[PDB]
Enzyme design. Structure first.
Site, short mmCIF file in Angstrom:
data_model
loop_
_atom_site.label_atom_id
_atom_site.label_comp_id
_atom_site.label_asym_id
_atom_site.label_seq_id
_atom_site.Cartn_x
_atom_site.Cartn_y
_atom_site.Cartn_z
N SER A 1 0.79 -1.22 0.00
CA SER A 1 0.00 0.00 0.00
C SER A 1 0.83 1.29 0.00
CB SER A 1 -0.87 0.08 1.28
OG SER A 1 0.00 0.09 2.44
N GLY B 1 -1.75 -4.47 1.34
CA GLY B 1 -1.81 -5.60 2.25
C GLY B 1 -0.84 -6.71 1.98
N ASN C 1 4.60 -5.32 5.69
CA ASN C 1 3.65 -6.34 6.10
C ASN C 1 4.28 -7.69 6.40
OD1 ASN C 1 1.45 -4.59 5.87
ND2 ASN C 1 1.52 -4.81 3.67
N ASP D 1 -3.06 7.31 9.84
CA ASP D 1 -2.29 6.31 10.52
C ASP D 1 -0.81 6.64 10.29
OD1 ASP D 1 -1.33 5.08 8.09
OD2 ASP D 1 -3.24 4.04 7.96
N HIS E 1 0.44 5.16 5.90
CA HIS E 1 -0.02 5.51 4.56
C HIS E 1 0.11 6.98 4.29
CE1 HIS E 1 -2.14 1.73 5.68
NE2 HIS E 1 -1.49 1.44 4.61
#
Ligand SMILES: *[C@@H]1O[C@H](CO)[C@@H](O[C@@H]2O[C@H](CO)[C@@H](O[C@@H]3O[C@H](CO[C@H]4O[C@H](CO[C@H]5O[C@H](CO)[C@@H](O)[C@H](O)[C@@H]5O)[C@@H](O)[C@H](O[C@H]5O[C@H](CO)[C@@H](O)[C@H](O)[C@@H]5O)[C@@H]4O)[C@@H](O)[C@H](O)[C@@H]3O)[C@H](O)[C@H]2NC(C)=O)[C@H](O)[C@H]1NC(C)=O
Ligand code: NAG
Length: 233
Positions: A9, A42, A74, A192, A195
């Protein structure tokens, strides 16, 4: 010439949602090559592999194309509560097994997934660039913290083992974030600490290209400009 992008992402079109965007969307403006952004929110090195997404690039890449691969956000966590993304621990040929999504999955280390992808592409004549992950907001607490994850050094190791190029995107992003300051960098992280807003994504893309120019990466051959702020590290 085509440049294929593989990542998560932080690179992908539409980012992590809610008005965020990925840095791969800001690269084409600076390259004479076609950019194909195959990043997906993700994903980890493991899940990108399992879903066949490295294989899909392999099918279509041809000699002289570039592939830029950037994972790490991730790739951590605990296999005891397997989320389908976490890689096996270690730096080499270690294997882990875990039942995920109805399969007893064979799980590799982060460097092994990247090395395997790199071999696939390199044998076809593509130019592979492994890139370290971007940082989460290093000004989250109000002062600057440079805290690389293990995946930064692992990307460098993987490039050395596979015999391909490495770009330390982490360090170039963190260097410019340090100089931009608390207020401005916090504005790049609307929802957050991962991002980026569109402005942040642009900064992050520019920092990749600064790294390319400073390091002499092969991609320099298709860059349209070298006018980017910051310094070489
Ligand atoms: C590093 O840069 C930081 C970002 O620029 C800077 O922090 C900002 O400082 C300014 C000036 O003091 C603050 O502006 C003032 O805000 C208060 C209202 O603050 C409260 O409400 C806001 C907004 O809340 C809503 O929106 C957010 C974001 O979408 C939601 O999270 C939230 O649920 C609400 O819907 C909120 O952001 C503030 O939260 C901060 O403060 C509380 C404690 O007070 C912390 O618990 C929280 O973690 C966060 O730090 C707060 O709840 C307003 O009344 C004033 O008039 C003025 O506009 C900004 O709030 C503040 N922003 C943030 C993101 O911190 C730092 O000061 C700077 N750090 C250093 C060391 O310099
Ligand atoms: C998953 O496969 C491995 C490799 O054969 C095996 O050791 C392990 O027992 C299997 N796991 C499950 C829970 O049976």
């Amino acid at each position: 010439t085509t440049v294929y992008l593989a990542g998560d992402s932080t690179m992908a079109k539409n980012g992590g949602g809610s008005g965020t965007n990925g840095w791969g969307e800001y690269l084409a403006s600076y390259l004479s090559a076609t950019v194909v952004n195959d990043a997906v929110a993700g994903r980890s090195a493991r899940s990108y592999t399992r879903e066949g997404r490295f294989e899909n690039i392999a099918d279509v890449v041809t000699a002289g194309d570039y592939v830029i691969v950037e994972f790490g956000h991730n790739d951590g966590g605990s296999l005891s509560t397997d989320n389908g993304r976490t890689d096996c621990s270690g730096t080499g040929a270690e294997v882990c097994y875990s039942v995920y999504d109805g399969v007893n999955e064979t799980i590799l280390t982060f460097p092994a997934y990247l090395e395997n992808a790199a071999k696939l592409f390199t044998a076809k004549g593509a130019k592979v660039i492994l890139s370290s992950q971007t940082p989460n907001n290093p000004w989250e607490t109000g002062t600057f913290v440079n805290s690389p994850t293990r995946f930064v050094e692992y990307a460098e190791l993987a490039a050395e083992v596979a015999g391909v190029e490495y770009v330390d995107h982490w360090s170039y992003v963190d260097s410019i974030y340090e100089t931009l300051g608390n207020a401005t960098v916090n504005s790049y992280f609307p929802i957050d600490h991962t991002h980026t807003s569109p402005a942040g994504a642009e900064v992050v893309a520019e920092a990749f290209l600064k790294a390319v120019v400073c390091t002499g990466t092969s991609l320099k051959s298709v860059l349209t400009t070298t006018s980017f702020e910051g310094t070489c590290l």
